[PDB]
Amino acid sequence: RAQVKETCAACQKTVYPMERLVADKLIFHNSCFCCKHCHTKLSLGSYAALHGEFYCKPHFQQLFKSKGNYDE
Numbered sequence: 009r010a011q012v013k014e015t016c017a018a019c020q021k022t023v024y025p026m027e028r029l030v031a032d033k034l035i036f037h038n039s040c041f042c043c044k045h046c047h048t049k050l051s052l053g054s055y056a057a058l059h060g061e062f063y064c065k066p067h068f069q070q071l072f073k074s075k076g077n078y079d080e
């Protein structure tokens with residue numbers, strides 16, 4: 009049962025309490041969510057997330073043409 013056993017969506021590993029963060033309602037390690045095109049550790053601070061994939065703002069703009077915003 010998931011109570012104190014959260015499973016991560018950015019690396020699918022069970023997240024431990026200190027690392028258990030919730031970005032965009034997805035529960036994961038604060039340390040793991042990187043861009044799906046480049047393993048850029050964009051975790052918590054400046055990131056662009058999409059259903060399924062976490063993307064860096066530059067790649068998100070080019071590849072998905074969704075958000076990004078890097079003085080753009």
Ligand SMILES: [Zn+2]
Nearest residue numbers: 016019037040
């Ligand atoms: Zn993770």
Ligand SMILES: [Zn+2]
Nearest residue numbers: 043046064067
């Ligand atoms: Zn990227």
